[PDB]
Amino acid sequence: MNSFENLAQDVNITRSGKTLIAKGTGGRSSRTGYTATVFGANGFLGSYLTAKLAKHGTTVVVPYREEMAKRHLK
Amino acid sequence: KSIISYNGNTIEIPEEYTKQAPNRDSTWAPAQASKTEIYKNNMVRFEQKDLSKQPMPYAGIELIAQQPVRFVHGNTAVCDGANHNGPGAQGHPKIFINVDAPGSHACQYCGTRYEKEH
Amino acid sequence: SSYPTNDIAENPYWKRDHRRAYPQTAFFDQKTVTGLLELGSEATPRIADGEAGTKALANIA
Amino acid sequence: RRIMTDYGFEGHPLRKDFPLTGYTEVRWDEEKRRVVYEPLELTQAFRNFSAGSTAWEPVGPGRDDRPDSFKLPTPKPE
Amino acid sequence: SAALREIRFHLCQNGSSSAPLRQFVKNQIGAFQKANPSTKVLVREANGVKPIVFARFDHGHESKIGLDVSSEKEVAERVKSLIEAK
Amino acid sequence: DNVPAHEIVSGAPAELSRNRVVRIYQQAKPATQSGEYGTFAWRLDWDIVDVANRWENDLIGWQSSGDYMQATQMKFTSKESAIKFANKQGWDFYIQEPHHRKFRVKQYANNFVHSYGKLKHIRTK
Amino acid sequence: AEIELTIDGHKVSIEAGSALIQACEKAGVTVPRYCYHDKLAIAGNCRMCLVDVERAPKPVASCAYPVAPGMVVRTDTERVKQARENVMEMMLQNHPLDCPVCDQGGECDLQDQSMRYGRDRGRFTEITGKRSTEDKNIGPLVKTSMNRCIHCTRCVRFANDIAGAPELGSSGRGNDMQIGTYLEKNLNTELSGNVIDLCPVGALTNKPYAFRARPWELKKTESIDVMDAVGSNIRIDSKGVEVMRVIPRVHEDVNEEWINDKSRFACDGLKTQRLTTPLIRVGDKFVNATWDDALSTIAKAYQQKAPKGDEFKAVAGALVEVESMVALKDMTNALGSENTTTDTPNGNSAPAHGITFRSNYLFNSSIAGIEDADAILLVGTNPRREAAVMNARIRKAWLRQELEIASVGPTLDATFDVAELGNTHADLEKALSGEFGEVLKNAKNPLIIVGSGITDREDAGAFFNTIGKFVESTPSVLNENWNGYNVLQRSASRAGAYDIGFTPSDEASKTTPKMVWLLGADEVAASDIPADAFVVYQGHNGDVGAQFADVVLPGAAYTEKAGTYVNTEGRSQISRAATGPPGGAREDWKILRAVSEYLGVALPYEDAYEVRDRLAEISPSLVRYDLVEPTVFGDVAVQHSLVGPNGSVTPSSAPLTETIENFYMTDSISRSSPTMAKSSIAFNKDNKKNQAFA
Amino acid sequence: MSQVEPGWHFWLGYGVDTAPCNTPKEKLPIRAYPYKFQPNYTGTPGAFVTYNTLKPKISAWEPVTKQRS
Amino acid sequence: GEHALRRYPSGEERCIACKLCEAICPALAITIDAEERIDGSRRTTKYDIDMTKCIYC
Amino acid sequence: AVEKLLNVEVPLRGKYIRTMFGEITRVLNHLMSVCSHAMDVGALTPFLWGFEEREKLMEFYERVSGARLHAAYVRPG
Amino acid sequence: AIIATAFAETVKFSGSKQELQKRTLALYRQFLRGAPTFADLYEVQFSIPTIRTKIRQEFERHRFVDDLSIQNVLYAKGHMEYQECINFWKQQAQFLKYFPEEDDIQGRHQPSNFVDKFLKNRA
Amino acid sequence: KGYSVPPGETYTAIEAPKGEMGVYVVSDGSERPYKCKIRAPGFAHLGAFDHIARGHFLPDAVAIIGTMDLVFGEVDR
Amino acid sequence: VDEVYEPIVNPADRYLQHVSDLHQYAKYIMAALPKYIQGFSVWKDELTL
C-alpha cells in the first residue's frame, strides 16, 4: 500500500485550532487534511514543492499571474 | 451572514446565497447539508467565483404545499400524473390512495393530496 | 403485438415459456457409449429383461 | 510472450482471483519527470451489485433433446 | 516473585492424558485454594488440549509446565515445583 | 504438506500472502426472503483492513477505497476446493461453518388440539 | 419413525405426520410459499404451495397436507404451473404499483415468484380500479403501507404465538379484511422487528431505514450481536462507511431466526455521538489532541502520580471484546496491579459465585435445553428484558409441553404464566424447601435460572449458597447427564471477563484508586472514581464515562472489529468487521499495546495471531468458536465456589429489584440512539396505546 | 451555441417543424417557478462549483464535561 | 446528451430514489443517497453523475 | 449468442430491422475501410466523398437509437 | 510462416532440475552481459553494477524453490523479461519498476516499530 | 437484477464486415456472464501480417494494413 | 395490417435432426480414437470433444 511519509501521525491539530484527520493510505485519492498556499508555485522550487504536497492530498492553493505558466501543476 | 471557518477566520456570504433554495431557507432532510456547512467546508473552491450564477433551483417541498387539496366522493382516490396534452404515458404508475381517515393523504410519487369531501 | 401472445383467454405463459424449455447439454463419457454399443438404445434395444438387464447395465456403469 | 498487457505487467487478468481494477495504477511524477507505477487508490470504490442476485432458482431443468438412439435402454419390466 | 497471583489449569474433559489432573482438581482444589488464599485459581476445559498449568507471579511474569503424568501425586509435585521455581 | 506454491507464479502482490486474511463461508439464508438459491455456493472474501477500506472524498462525497480486494468474491462448489485454492495461493483463512435450520415435525392439526386445562393462549389462525 | 415417499421421482424419507413441504425441502425440491414459515404455525391461505398428489383429485397444499407412506407427488406438471399462475394473478389483482417506492424491492418474494412461477403480463384492466387500504400507526419502529398486504398472517401468528402480543389481528371480512389493531394501538414488544423480516412484502418495514438503501448496494457481513449475552447471530448490511441495518441470522442453538429491537434498531447510535479524535481535559473543557499527545499525557500522569500496586484500576464495561480485556489485564498486571474490575454496582469485589469453574457463571443447561424443560425457577431475572429471545424460547416450550414456571423476584409482565411466589430471600428458601422444591425434585429437566442482578447485590453469597445447597442436595438439578444451575448474564463481556480472570483481589477491593482506566465503562456512578484520580476512558461513544474522563481515547465499535465474544452458554463467537472505525479511532488492543509501550512496560504480542495465541494461553475455549463445551466438574464447582465461602453472608430483607429499568437505553450505543429514545418515550406502560383494557 | 434558448436549440437542428413562437399553449411546459436561462459559464467566475449535498455520515461527539461529585 | 432531473407541473421533483438508474448504469456513473423527507416523502438527498464516467447510453 | 442461450425467438420485424441495419453498418464499414485504404495509399478525395454518405447513414442510426455511433439498439431479444 | 523474434526461446519444460540449472545459469549470464545495453537503451541514472546487483537480487528471490514446474514457469517468465528488455520494447517507465531504491527518499516517517504504525494507523 | 440465462455455452458468429466475428459465452445460470471471449476478425489478420508482408517493400505494408481493415478496439478488445 | 399473426414455436425444435447427426458423428470419432476422446457433448448444433 501507499504511505503518508510526510506525516508522523494521522490526527494532526494545527496551532490555530483545526483538527486534521488524514484519510486514506497516502496516495492520490488520499487527503492529509492540510491546506497550503505556495506563492511562487509557478517557478523552479515551487513546482517541486507543490508536487510533493499534492502527492499526498494536501490542498494547495496556487496564486498565479500568468494563466499559462501554471498548467503543469494541476 | 458571516460564517466562522475551521481555522478561526470569517467567511462572509450574502443572505441570498445561504438559503437552501430561493423559496426555502432551511433544509428538508436530516442528512442534507446546509449552505453554511457547504461553504465552511468548500470555500477554497468558491473563493473568486460568482454565486450569482451557480445552480439554485426551487425546492419542491414548498411548491407542492401550494397545490390545493383534491376532493373525491368515496374511499379511494386514483392518481396518475399524466400530461393529457401529449401522447404516451408521461406520468407515474397508477396509484390508489385511501382517504377514509380524517386528514389529507398524499401520493407516493407526486405529493398531490386527497381528502374525503370533508 | 401478435395474436396468440396478446390473447387474454387461452394463453397460459407456461405453454410459451421457451426459456425454461431449454435443451439440456448431453454429455457422453466412454462408459455411456459402450452401453449404447454392448447393449442397444431405446430405439434398438439389445438388452435382457428384468433385473438381468438392470445389472447388465450396472456392469457397464 | 504477452500480447495484450503492459510490458511489465505482473499478473494474469482473467483469473477469478485477479481483481477487476488490478493492483497498480499510473501517474506522471513531476519530481522524477516520469510515468510512475504506484499502488491503487480509487476516488470512487467499485460497487459490485452482485449481492442482488436472485434468491429463487430462475430456470429449472431443461428439456431432454437426446435422440432415442443415444438414450440407454430401459430393460422391459418382466 | 513476591507471590503467586494467578494459577490456570488447562485440561481436556475425556482425554487419557488429563485424568490425573482431573482427579487433582476434583480432590485437592480446596486445599490448594486454602494454601494459597490470595491467588486466582482458574480451571478451564476444552476438548483436545494437552494438560498444562500456568502460574503468574508478579509484573506479569508467567511460567508453565505440562502435566502429562500418570498420577495425582506427580501433578501435585509438579505444581509445587512451578510455584516454588518462581 | 507438499502443496505447490502457485503464489510464486501468480504475479500477485506478496501482501496477500503475508498480511491478509480471507473468510470461506456459505451465504446465510436471508431473513428477508424464503429463497435459498444464493446459498449452496462457498464464497471466498477478503477481510477488511481499516486504513484502506472506505473514506469519503472532500470534493463531491464519493466513498474512496485503497483496498483492491474489497469487491472481489470467488465462488466455489465445496469447502475443500476453496481450501485447496487458498493454500495454493498462500492465503490464511478462517472457515465459517454453516448453521442449518433444525428439523421439527409440523402439523396443521396441532393448531386445533384439545386443551384439557386452562387455555395457554387463544390462537387467531 | 421415518416413512418413504416419492417426490418428482426422487425417494425421500422423513418422520410421519410431517408436512409435504418439509419433504420437498429435504429432497431439494423447491416449492413456492408466502404464508408458510418453518417457525410459525401452518396457515394455508396463500394457496401457492399447491402440488399434485396421485391420491387426491384436486391439487393439495404442501404446507398442510400430511406426509403419508407410498404417496407420489409431482411439482412439475401443467396443473401445478397453471395453479401458480392463477394464484399470482389473483394476488397481484389488487396489489399496488409501489415497487419503486417500496423498501422490499430487490428482496421481495412476490417479485421473484411472479417472475419465476407466474405470468409475464396481467389481464386486470378494470376501470373501477384496485382496492385501497389505510395505513396504520403501530409505533415508531414498524412503518405501514398496508395496500401491499397480501394477507399471509405471518405477523399475527408471530405476535400472538412467539411474542405474546395479541394486539395484532385480522379485522373485517372478505376483500375489506384488514390486518392491524382495530383501534389505534402500538405493537408493544421487544421482538417487534422480526415482523419486518417475516412479511414477504413491504407492508411492514423499518422506519429509521425507510428509504436509505437498496439491497444490492449492501455488503453483507455475518457477525455477532452485542447488547445482550445471548450472542445472537446477525447480518450487518453496510453501504460504505455507514452501517444501514442489522437483521437476524439462523442459529438454532442461540437465537433461532430472531433478534430483539435493541439489537436491530440501536445501529442508529453508531453514527452519532461517536468519538473520532482523542481529547484532553484542560479544565471544564475538552481539547482535541493527537495520539502522541494523549499517550504522553497518560504516561506523565503515571509518573507524576506513582500509583503503587493496586492503585491502578482497570474497569471493563459491556460491549467490550475479550482481546481488549486480555490486553488491559496484562498491562494492569505488568504495572503491578490486580484491581481488574467490572462496571457493575458491586464490581469492585469479586463475584460471590466465583470464577474458578466456568459452570458457576454460565447457562449450563444450554439455550436449546430450555426446550427440554419441565420446570423452571426464575431467581432475580426478567428474561423479557434480559435475553428476550430466551424468553421467546421459554414461551415456545411452555406452549407445547407441560412446563411449570415459578419466579422469586419482582412481579414481571411475562409472556407466560409464571406463578409468582415472592420477592425476598426468605421466600426463596420457603419455595425451595416447600412446594416448588418438590416440583423441581420430581422433574427430569429442571432449570434454576439466576440473574446477574443477584451478583450485583451485597448479600449474593446468601442466595448462591442456598441455590448451591439445593442443587447438590437434589439429583435432578445436577446429574451426569444434565446441569440445571444456570446464571443468566445481561451483558456480552461478563462471561469472557470471568473466563480470562478479569476480577479483583480483596487486597485491591479495599484500595482507593489513583488511576482509573475505564474501558467501554459507561455505568459508573461518579462515586466509584475519586475526584483526585487520573481517568482514561476508552470507547466509541460519548455518553457517561467520557464526561468524567481526563483523557479520552477513541476506539472501535462491534461493527468495526473482528472480536471474540462469549455468551451465556460459554459459546465463543467471532465477529467480522463490516467497516473501519471512524476518523482517528483505532482497535482497542492496539491502543493498549501502544500505551503499554509508552508506559514502562510492553505486551509481548504485536498482531492478531499473537493475540489469539495469548487467548489460547489464557483459556483454550476462547478459540473453539461456536462450540458449547460440557463440563466434568459440576459437583466440584457447586461444592467449592457457591456453598463453601458464602455461609458467612447473612441475607438482607431488601426486596429484589428489577435490574434493567429500561430495556431500551441500556448501553452507550443505545443511549446514543434517537430511535431508542423514541421507543422509550413510546412503549411506556403509562401510555394508552400500550395497554389494552381487557 | 450555449446562448441559444432551448426550444430553438431543437428547432435549430430540425427536430420540430414548429418554433416555440408558434407552438400551441398546451404543448408548452407548465412551470410553477420562474424561468431563468443561463448559458455555459465555463472559463468565468460563474463556472459550476460541485459539492456534496450531504453531510458526513458519522456525526462526532460535541465534548461536554461533568464533575465528580 | 446532457442529463437533467425533471419535475411535475406541481413543481415537485419526479425522482423517488428507487435506484434503478444507479443499478442499470454500465459505467457506475450515478451515485444516489436518500432518506425520508420532512413531509414523509421518498426523495433524494444526493444525486450525482460523473459525466467523465458516463457513456450516454 | 444470448438468444441462443435463452432459447427465445426474435420477431420477424426485429429480424428485418437487424438485417437492414446490419447492411447499413456494412456500408459504413466499407466506406471507412476502402476510403481509408485509398487515403493511406494516397487518394484523398474518396475519403471525403464517402464520409458524407456516412453522415447520411449516421442520421438513420441517430433517428433509430439516439446515437450517431454507439447505438445500443440491437439487444438480446 | 510466423517466425519468432530476435531473442525468442521455444517453450520447453525441462524434465530435470539439472538441465534447468544450466538454462537458468545461461539466462543469468545473458542478463549480466546485457546490462550495459539496458543502461544505454534506457537512460539510466545509475551504475551498471547496480543493474547487475538487481539482477542478482531477483535471481536470489527464487533460489530455494524446489518444485520443478514452478522453476520452469519462472525460467520462462525470466526469458520473457529478457526479451522485453534487450529488444527495446519496454520504455524507461516500465524498466524502472525494478529500481525503486534509486529514486530519492520517500519522506521522513517510514515506520519500522509498533507505535509509529499505530500513530499512522498501519498496525 | 437482470434476466437469468440458462447454464451452458455457445460460440456463434456472424459475417461482420471485417470477417467472421464471434462470441464464446459461458453462462453459469446467473444474470452475469462467467466468460465472454470475442473472436475479433482483425486479431487473426494482424497475426497473419508476418506471413503476408514478408518479401514486400514498406509502401506495400501500408496497403496490406489497409486491406486487412484493422480497427484496433477489436484487435485488442 | 389489422392483426399481426406470429406462431409460437420453440427455437430448439429446429435443431433435432442435426443434433442426432452430430451425436452419430461424435460416436464415430470416439470409436476411431478411443485412446484420446474422453467424451463428447452436444447442444444446439455445437459439438464439443
Ligand SMILES: NC(=O)C1=CN([C@@H]2O[C@H](COP(=O)(O)OP(=O)(O)OC[C@H]3O[C@@H](n4cnc5c(N)ncnc54)[C@H](OP(=O)(O)O)[C@@H]3O)[C@@H](O)[C@H]2O)C=CC1
Ligand atoms: N534559484 C536559486 O538558485 C535560488 C533561489 N532563491 C530564492 O528562493 C525562491 C526560489 O525561486 P526560484 O526557485 O529561483 O525560481 P523562481 O525564482 O523562478 O520563482 C519565482 C517565483 O516568484 C514569483 N514572482 C516573482 N516576482 C513576483 C512578483 N513581483 N509578484 C508576484 N510573484 C512574483 C514568480 O512568479 P512568475 O513565475 O509569475 O514570474 C515565480 O513563481 C525565491 O525566493 C528566490 O529568490 C534563493 C537562493 C538561490
Ligand code: SF4
Ligand atoms: S411488496 Fe414487493 S411487489 Fe409489492 S410493491 Fe413492494 S417490492 Fe413491489
Ligand code: SF4
Ligand atoms: S401485514 Fe405483512 S406479514 Fe402481515 S399478513 Fe399482511 S403481508 Fe403478511
Ligand code: SF4
Ligand atoms: S432513482 Fe433514478 S430511476 Fe429512480 S426515480 Fe430517481 S432518477 Fe428515476
Ligand code: SF4
Ligand atoms: S452512462 Fe449515462 S445514460 Fe448510461 S446509465 Fe450512466 S448516466 Fe445514464
Ligand code: FES
Ligand atoms: S404455503 Fe401453503 S397455502 Fe401458503
Ligand SMILES: [Zn+2]
Ligand atoms: Zn400521483
